[PDB]
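Hey all, sorry for the wall of text incoming. These are the two entities for the joint prediction.
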Amino acid sequence: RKTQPYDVYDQVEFDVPIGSRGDCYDRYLCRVEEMRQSLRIISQCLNKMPPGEI
Amino acid sequence: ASKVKQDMPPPGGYGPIDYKRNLPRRGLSGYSMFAVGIGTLLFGYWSMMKWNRERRRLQIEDFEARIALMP
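and here's what came out:
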Protein backbone atom coordinates (compact mmCIF):
# COMPACT_ATOMS: atom_id res chain seq x y z
CA ARG A 1 0.00 0.00 0.00
CA LYS A 2 2.99 2.33 0.49
CA THR A 3 5.40 1.20 -2.24
CA GLN A 4 2.95 0.16 -4.99
CA PRO A 5 -0.42 1.78 -4.21
CA TYR A 6 -3.38 0.80 -6.35
CA ASP A 7 -6.69 2.57 -5.78
CA VAL A 8 -6.48 5.77 -3.69
CA TYR A 9 -4.00 4.53 -1.09
CA ASP A 10 -1.66 7.36 -2.13
CA GLN A 11 -4.23 9.83 -0.72
CA VAL A 12 -4.39 8.40 2.82
CA GLU A 13 -1.85 8.61 5.64
CA PHE A 14 -0.89 5.80 8.02
CA ASP A 15 2.11 4.14 9.63
CA VAL A 16 3.54 0.66 9.03
CA PRO A 17 4.32 -1.31 12.21
CA ILE A 18 7.76 -2.92 12.22
CA GLY A 19 9.07 -5.65 14.51
CA SER A 20 12.62 -6.22 15.70
CA ARG A 21 12.78 -9.83 16.96
CA GLY A 22 10.97 -11.84 14.28
CA ASP A 23 8.97 -13.94 16.75
CA CYS A 24 5.27 -14.51 17.45
CA TYR A 25 5.01 -11.67 19.98
CA ASP A 26 6.28 -9.05 17.52
CA ARG A 27 3.85 -10.23 14.82
CA TYR A 28 0.98 -10.02 17.32
CA LEU A 29 2.01 -6.45 18.19
CA CYS A 30 2.23 -5.65 14.47
CA ARG A 31 -1.30 -6.94 13.87
CA VAL A 32 -2.76 -4.90 16.74
CA GLU A 33 -1.03 -1.76 15.48
CA GLU A 34 -2.27 -2.51 11.96
CA MET A 35 -5.82 -2.58 13.31
CA ARG A 36 -5.21 0.86 14.82
CA GLN A 37 -3.76 2.20 11.55
CA SER A 38 -6.71 0.82 9.57
CA LEU A 39 -9.03 2.66 11.97
CA ARG A 40 -7.06 5.79 11.06
CA ILE A 41 -7.47 5.07 7.34
CA ILE A 42 -11.20 4.40 7.81
CA SER A 43 -11.58 7.81 9.45
CA GLN A 44 -9.84 9.47 6.51
CA CYS A 45 -11.98 7.55 3.99
CA LEU A 46 -15.17 8.54 5.83
CA ASN A 47 -14.19 12.21 5.70
CA LYS A 48 -13.17 12.25 2.01
CA MET A 49 -15.93 10.31 0.23
CA PRO A 50 -16.60 12.13 -3.07
CA PRO A 51 -19.84 12.10 -5.07
CA GLY A 52 -20.44 10.68 -8.54
CA GLU A 53 -21.21 7.37 -10.18
CA ILE A 54 -20.05 4.02 -8.82
CA ALA B 1 -35.69 16.84 -11.24
CA SER B 2 -34.80 17.55 -7.62
CA LYS B 3 -31.27 17.84 -6.27
CA VAL B 4 -28.92 14.87 -6.29
CA LYS B 5 -29.23 12.93 -3.03
CA GLN B 6 -26.37 10.57 -2.18
CA ASP B 7 -24.89 9.06 0.94
CA MET B 8 -22.30 11.61 1.93
CA PRO B 9 -20.39 12.93 4.93
CA PRO B 10 -22.06 15.79 6.87
CA PRO B 11 -21.31 19.52 6.39
CA GLY B 12 -17.86 20.37 7.64
CA GLY B 13 -16.65 17.02 8.95
CA TYR B 14 -17.20 13.93 11.10
CA GLY B 15 -15.79 14.00 14.63
CA PRO B 16 -12.21 12.81 15.21
CA ILE B 17 -11.82 9.09 15.87
CA ASP B 18 -9.39 7.77 18.46
CA TYR B 19 -6.97 5.02 17.50
CA LYS B 20 -3.91 5.19 19.79
CA ARG B 21 -3.18 2.73 22.58
CA ASN B 22 -4.66 3.75 25.95
CA LEU B 23 -3.36 1.80 28.97
CA PRO B 24 -3.33 3.98 32.11
CA ARG B 25 -0.78 3.46 34.87
CA ARG B 26 -3.30 2.82 37.67
CA GLY B 27 -1.25 1.45 40.54
CA LEU B 28 0.58 2.12 43.77
CA SER B 29 4.35 2.05 44.08
CA GLY B 30 6.21 -1.10 45.05
CA TYR B 31 7.36 0.40 48.35
CA SER B 32 3.78 0.92 49.54
CA MET B 33 2.71 -2.64 48.71
CA PHE B 34 5.78 -4.16 50.36
CA ALA B 35 5.20 -2.00 53.45
CA VAL B 36 1.53 -3.03 53.71
CA GLY B 37 2.46 -6.70 53.37
CA ILE B 38 5.17 -6.52 56.02
CA GLY B 39 2.85 -4.65 58.39
CA THR B 40 0.15 -7.28 57.95
CA LEU B 41 2.71 -10.01 58.64
CA LEU B 42 3.92 -8.33 61.83
CA PHE B 43 0.39 -7.75 63.13
CA GLY B 44 -0.46 -11.40 62.49
CA TYR B 45 2.73 -12.55 64.20
CA TRP B 46 1.98 -10.57 67.36
CA SER B 47 -1.65 -11.72 67.52
CA MET B 48 -0.56 -15.33 67.04
CA MET B 49 2.03 -14.91 69.80
CA LYS B 50 -0.62 -13.83 72.30
CA TRP B 51 -3.05 -16.57 71.30
CA ASN B 52 -0.43 -19.34 71.39
CA ARG B 53 0.77 -18.33 74.86
CA GLU B 54 -2.82 -18.38 76.12
CA ARG B 55 -3.30 -21.83 74.56
CA ARG B 56 -0.14 -23.10 76.27
CA ARG B 57 -1.49 -21.94 79.64
CA LEU B 58 -4.81 -23.68 78.94
CA GLN B 59 -3.02 -26.92 78.06
CA ILE B 60 -1.05 -26.72 81.31
CA GLU B 61 -4.32 -26.33 83.23
CA ASP B 62 -5.90 -29.38 81.56
CA PHE B 63 -2.76 -31.45 82.17
CA GLU B 64 -2.89 -30.48 85.85
CA ALA B 65 -6.51 -31.64 86.03
CA ARG B 66 -5.42 -34.99 84.58
CA ILE B 67 -2.58 -35.20 87.12
CA ALA B 68 -5.03 -34.55 89.96
CA LEU B 69 -7.36 -37.28 88.69
CA MET B 70 -4.70 -39.93 87.97
CA PRO B 71 -4.29 -41.72 91.37
